[PDB]
């Protein structure tokens, strides 16, 4: 899809008005399937490890999030289509430069490839960036062909602040989602009863990320 039009005429107004934006059929079936195969190859070869939290304390991470993950830069062998996904995400964000709130987006995390391996795993209600670590936009791509949420669950429920309805996002094949990462969008992954895959990148606001890095580097 042409990035300029999609960014400026849809993603920008949707993000500013609602803080959440869904783009269905982002890359098309062939590319989505190739991504699914690359992800399943990562799973099958033991690459995933338990998802972790910003601040680890007495409780097991698995009491909080039951997913297993790996980080992808985009250039690894066997991850070329994930890299194309990431570049397509980046292209949309670059065409949004300066139009997403007051943020100035100069960078992002690596891609987090995540799997909830059925069995009722999920993620308790939480905020992606509650204390100002730099993350301003969460971008997620779903690649679950044949997902039937009424049976397998796995719905991402977002509680956008100040709204009269919450937002239920099925983890549908080839769906791209953006939302503000801060406290405006508490959210949860409801229990999944089938293997559920998603790829996430978080985009950074330059000034907030600089302050967060200064805090980390000074203790």
């Amino acid at each position: 899809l042409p990035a300029l039009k999609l960014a400026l005429e849809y993603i920008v107004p949707c993000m500013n008005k609602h803080g959440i934006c869904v783009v269905d059929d982002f890359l098309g079936k062939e590319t989505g399937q190739q991504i699914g195969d690359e992800v399943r190859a990562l799973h099958d070869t033991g690459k995933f490890t338990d998802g972790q939290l910003v601040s680890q304390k007495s409780d097991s991470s698995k009491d909080i999030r039951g997913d297993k993950i790996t980080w992808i830069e985009g250039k690894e062998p066997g991850c070329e289509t994930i890299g194309l996904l990431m570049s397509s995400m980046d292209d949309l964000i670059r065409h949004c430069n300066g139009k997403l709130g007051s943020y100035k987006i100069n960078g992002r995390t690596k891609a987090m490839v995540a799997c909830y391996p059925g069995n009722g795993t999920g993620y308790v209600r939480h905020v992606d960036n509650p204390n100002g670590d730099g993350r301003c936009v969460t971008c997620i791509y779903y690649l679950n062909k044949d997902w039937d949420a009424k049976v397998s669950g796995g719905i991402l429920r977002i509680f956008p602040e100040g709204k009269a309805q919450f937002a239920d996002i099925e983890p549908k094949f080839d769906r791209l989602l953006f939302f503000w990462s801060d406290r405006r969008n508490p959210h949860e992954v409801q229990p999944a009863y089938a293997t559920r895959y998603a790829i996430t990148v978080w985009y950074f606001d330059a000034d907030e990320r600089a302050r967060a890095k200064v805090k980390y580097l000074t203790g």
Partner: peptide
């Protein structure tokens, strides 16, 4: 109130971030 960072998904704080 609960420290929400104990529920937030980890990202690396060191190294670089990917620059756009």
């Amino acid at each position: 109130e609960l420290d929400l960072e104990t529920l937030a998904p980890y990202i690396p704080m060191d190294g670089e971030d990917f620059q756009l």
